[PDB]
Amino acid sequence: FQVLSTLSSTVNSKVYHALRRGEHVAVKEISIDDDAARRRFQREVNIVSTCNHPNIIRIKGVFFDGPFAYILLPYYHRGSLRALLSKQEPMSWVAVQDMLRQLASGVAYLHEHGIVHGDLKPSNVLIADDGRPVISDFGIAKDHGVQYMAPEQLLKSTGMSDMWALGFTMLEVALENAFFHDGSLGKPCLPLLLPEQKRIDVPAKAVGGDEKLAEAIASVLVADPGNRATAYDLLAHPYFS
Numbered sequence: 001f002q003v004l005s006t007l008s009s010t011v012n013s014k015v016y017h018a019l020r021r022g023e024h025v026a027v028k029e030i031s032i033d034d035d036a037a038r039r040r041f042q043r044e045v046n047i048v049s050t051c052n053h054p055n056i057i058r059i060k061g062v063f064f065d066g067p068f069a070y071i072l073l074p075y076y077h078r079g080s081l082r083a084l085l086s087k088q089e090p091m092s093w094v095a096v097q098d099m100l101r102q103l104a105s106g107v108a109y110l111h112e113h114g115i116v117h118g119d120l121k122p123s124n125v126l127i128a129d130d131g132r133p134v135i136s137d138f139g140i141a142k143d144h145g146v147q148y149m150a151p152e153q154l155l156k157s158t159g160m161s162d163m164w165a166l167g168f169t170m171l172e173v174a175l176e177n178a179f180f181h182d183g184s185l186g187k188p189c190l191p192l193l194l195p196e197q198k199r200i201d202v203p204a205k206a207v208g209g210d211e212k213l214a215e216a217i218a219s220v221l222v223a224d225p226g227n228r229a230t231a232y233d234l235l236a237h238p239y240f241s
Contacts (some may be wrong), residue, residue, distance in 0.1 A: 001027060002061070008143045015074060015143055024075040025060065026144055041069060044241035047139030050113055055106035057126070057144065058138040072145050076134065081118035081173065085122060093208065096127040098171055099133050101240045106135045108164055108231035111159045115139075116161060118157040120165040121148055122172060147190045151223045160225035163234070167200075167220035174207035174217065181208060198223055212239040 001020035016027045031185050032038040032164035049059055059074040078084075086093070103125060110117055113172045117138045124145035128220040135144030150164035168190065175188035200221035202214040219229040235241065 001025065003027075010143065013143065019047065020072070022027050023065070024077065026073040026075045027142070028071040028073065028140065030069050030071075031067050032064075032069050041140070042218070044140035044142070045071065047115060048141055049116070051109065053104070053106055053109045055102045055133055055135060056109065057134055057141050071140055073136075073141060074126075074128075074134070076126045076128055076132075078129065080123050081125040081127065081133065081169070082122040084127060085173065085176045088176075090179055091177050092236060093177070093210070095212075096173060096177060097130075098194050099131075099234070100173065103133045103135070104166065104231060104234050104240060106133070107162060108235055110135070110138075111231050116157045116159055117165075120162055120169055122169055125169065142148070147192055150225065151193055152225050158225065159230065163220040163228050163231060164225075164232075166231075167217050170213075170222070171200075171202065171217050174210075174213055178208035193221075193223055210239070212237070216240065 001018040004017040004019060006014060007017050007026060014029045014032060016029065018025050018027045030041060032041050045059065045062065045085070048057060057073065060074065062072070063070050085165045107117070107120070113136070117135065119137060124135065126134040126136050126145055128134050137143065141214035148165050148168045153161055172190060175235045179185050179188055185206065188206065193200060199218060202218045203222070204211040207213050207217070216234060219237060220234060222228045
């Protein structure tokens with residue numbers, strides 16, 4: 001493969017933008033000479049390769065050269081949901097519903113396979129060529145793809161804290177799109193949970209008038225994780241069902 005650029009660099013990790021035979025790919029390079037590193041690599045690859053879902057990032061291949069491992073991942077020219085929001089162009093509310101349902105379906109799949117993502121946000125939701133959302137930035141795909149921290153994390157990561165992050169992802173998409181459709185709503189600010197607050201209030205007016213969308217978001221922005229909707233609960237909500 002032919003390397004175009006370095007998309008990210010840490011210690012003991014690089015991610016490259018490459019052209020492997022006419023096709024664009026992301027390539028993560030790591031050293032696995034050490035047994036501890038090799039076992040960590042196996043766990044992180046298996047977290048991702050466990051998944052077989054259209055809305056979860058897929059590994060294209062892994063190959064070895066001496067002590068180095070190369071993990072081939074898709075390169076998505078359309079970028080992330082963050083990049084889409086930064087364009088500030090109105091999006092169809094029907095397409096938004098379909099995108100958010102697929103995203104919630106991906107999260108449900110992760111949780112059903114015992115995987116906590118830990119860092120769901122617009123930057124980590126990639127947009128495939130056909131427009132579908134693709135969850136990345138977990139397991140070995142870490143580095144391929146704040147109000148977002150669940151209250152209980154301010155005092156580890158669980159399925160519940162994922163649902164809080166998904167709620168704020170949904171909320172940022174909805175607040176921004178509503179503004180893009182109706183500039184008289186004003187530039188939106190993401191709310192913060194104040195001490196001794198039960199839940200984030202989501203007025204239908206702020207998310208474009210869709211009461212079902214507001215209620216779906218509100219069901220996961222509950223301060224008490226035991227009272228928060230699960231991913232399966234959220235998919236059963238009228239907005240999605």
